[PDB]
């Protein structure tokens, strides 16, 4: 029992973190096999970031301009290229600590763990979600660029995020490990504002199922609803529209608890319309949306890696 | 920017987790140098836990009755003993992944990371606090006993907790790594109720300082207070009494923000008396008390290990 915001164990990723320095700029890179991946803005000065031409800036760089350090394991750079907004630095040594891994591009609503690092050295780990507006709500200070987000399924680390930018509103933007930004964001210090921070409805519902499993039961009511009726309410409260696909994903949690998905939607509708009345659910005074159905099943059944 | 509930990177501890089986019971152990530490209740059946005599139960056990597996690294048990509520299993091989470590017994109010494990295999990591009533609010399923709590300072892992028991109220009890329970709890399935879940006042204040550092500023008011006046209020709301020692610990955060500790106490007093009025602080609708002053400084300055 109990339910916590739970990150993946970080050891497999810790072993892949390196420091990358190019002239004046130090950030983090990810060493997998004989390639180091890092943000391309490692080649930029502060002033360059107002309007960088990355192809032109990179013409002034050779392999030897990139200093890569794994702890004190100093790595030899033997090739470089740009792929979208990441650099790939080919080194002469394959990382011996390389875990089984894949690169995935996640959808808004999906959750992942972040290993926040500075100067190649991991500082902490926390859990977050790709928001519907394609930002993440992280914890990143200067030097954290190149820190990565990931999921682990038994043997396999699925890397989904590399940190690149903090927006003026203090939320975070970055890329998949192919270097494509999530959402419309760019690696330029510019006017980039985030869209609506909508609530991930299917995650809220998952968390209510988690709540029930733990004896937090007060919000169950007498009511049901329909998808269309519930969605009128979601729209008012800037919640994502719920689809039958979402209902299907919640099927296992429904089956476990014997609470029909549409009955849990009717509970959620009442919470939206009436609030919490100063009560709490799983230690929260607001409706939490950064646990997925899969997250709830994992934590409630003790899946290991 | 941003502020998250942030665990220590778990790799150093992942390398120390093993499976311990004695007859029918499998839980987790911690392998440091040539010793495996685990809950003594590994020797108990379900039925034994209603009223175990551990010295007598252990008379029926020899070294070969303890099966210890590190991944598939099968370890050879060459000695055993009981120390308070833990068993120490001497093995014939020193763990090659042993980090620099110490054993500490923490005070209520202190925070630590937990690596939740099953069958010797780590599942996730989250951050929690020793509550004033000496319980922790964790996430533990059957098989998680022997999972550990720790802090990391650069090179050194300070182990402070080993999980032993879930109480009927779904909160958690356990030991330091010398096997002494925190609080009055015992390793027997009995009537054990938790005392008052009081709020860790100095942690709340630390978190308000964290909030200010991030632009969450709305709760700053015109008022000040005194220690004695504030404490009349703390008592009403089942908050720990604030001491001058606590004020001193908050000195760095005061100096950083230029907000006097007693002025932040006056802000907290208003939040207690008036509530949040449906507003949020650092993504929370209630006053968070599981970040220490040291936690806030760490996360706000990017300390690494």
Curated annotation (Swiss-Prot), chains A, B:
The active site is at residues 41, 145. It catalyses: TSAVLQ-|-SGFRK-NH2 and SGVTFQ-|-GKFKK the two peptides corresponding to the two self-cleavage sites of the SARS 3C-like proteinase are the two most reactive peptide substrates. The enzyme exhibits a strong preference for substrates containing Gln at P1 position and Leu at P2 position. Changing residue 205 to V: In strain: Zeta/P.2. Residues 1-305 are cytoplasmic. Inhibited by pyridone-containing alpha-ketoamides compounds 13a and 13b. In turn, alpha-ketoamide 13b (tert-butyl (1-((S)-1-(((S)-4-(benzylamino)-3,4-dioxo-1-((S)-2-oxopyrrolidin-3-yl)butan-2-yl)amino)-3-cyclopropyl-1-oxopropan-2-yl)-2-oxo-1,2-dihydropyridin-3-yl)carbamate) inhibits SARS-CoV-2 replication in human lung cells. Inhibited ex vivo by michael acceptor inhibitor N3. Inhibited ex vivo by compound 11a and 11b. It is found in: Host cytoplasm; Host Golgi apparatus; Host nucleus. Residues 1-305 form the Peptidase C30 domain. Coiled coil: none annotated. It comes from the Viruses. There is a cross-link at residues 5, 90 (Glycyl lysine isopeptide (Lys-Gly) (interchain with G-Cter in ubiquitin)). 3CL-PRO exists as monomer and homodimer. Only the homodimer shows catalytic activity. Interacts with host FBXO22; this interaction promotes the proteasomal degradation of nsp5. Cleaves the C-terminus of replicase polyprotein at 11 sites. Recognizes substrates containing the core sequence [ILMVF]-Q-|-[SGACN]. Cleaves and inactivates human TRMT1, preventing tRNA guanine(26)-dimethylation of tRNAs. May cleave human NLRP1 in lung epithelial cells, thereby activating the NLRP1 inflammasome pathway. May cleave human GSDMD, triggering alternative GSDME-mediated epithelial cell death upon activation of the NLRP1 inflammasome, which may enhance the release interleukins 1B, 6, 16 and 18. Also able to bind an ADP-ribose-1''-phosphate (ADRP). This is 3C-like proteinase nsp5. The chain holds residues 3264 to 3568 of 7096 of the full protein.
């Amino acid at each position: 029992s109990g339910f916590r915001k739970m990150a993946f164990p970080s050891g497999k990723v810790e072993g892949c973190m390196v420091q990358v320095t190019c002239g004046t700029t130090t950030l983090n890179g990810l060493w997998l096999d004989d390639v180091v991946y890092c943000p391309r803005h490692v080649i930029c000065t502060s002033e360059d970031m107002l309007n960088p031409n990355y192809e032109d800036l990179l013409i002034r760089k050779s392999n030897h301009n990139f200093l890569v350090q794994a702890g004190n394991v100093q790595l030899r750079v033997i090739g470089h290229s740009m792929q979208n907004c990441v650099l790939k630095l080919k080194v002469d040594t394959a990382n011996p600590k390389t875990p089984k891994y894949k690169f995935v591009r996640i959808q808004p609503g999906q959750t992942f763990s972040v290993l926040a690092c500075y100067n190649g050295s991991p500082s902490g780990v926390y859990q977050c979600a790709m928001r519907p507006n394609f930002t993440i709500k992280g914890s990143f200070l200067n030097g954290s660029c190149g820190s990565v987000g990931f999921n682990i399924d038994y043997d396999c680390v699925s890397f989904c995020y590399m940190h690149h930018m903090e927006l003026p509103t203090g939320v975070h933007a970055g890329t998949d490990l192919e270097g494509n930004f999530y959402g419309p964001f760019v690696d330029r210090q510019t006017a980039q504002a985030a869209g609506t921070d909508t609530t991930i409805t299917v995650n809220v519902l998952a968390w209510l199922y988690a709540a029930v499993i733990n004896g937090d039961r007060w919000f169950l009511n007498r009511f049901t609803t329909t998808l269309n009726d519930f969605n009128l309410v979601a729209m008012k409260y800037n919640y994502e529209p719920l689809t039958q696909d979402h209902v299907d994903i919640l099927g296992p949690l429904s089956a476990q608890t014997g609470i029909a998905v549409l009955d849990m939607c009717a509970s959620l509708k009442e919470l939206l319309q009436n609030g919490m009345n100063g009560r709490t659910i799983l230690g929260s005074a607001l409706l939490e949306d950064e646990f997925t159905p899969f997250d709830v099943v994992r934590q409630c059944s003790g899946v290991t890696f």
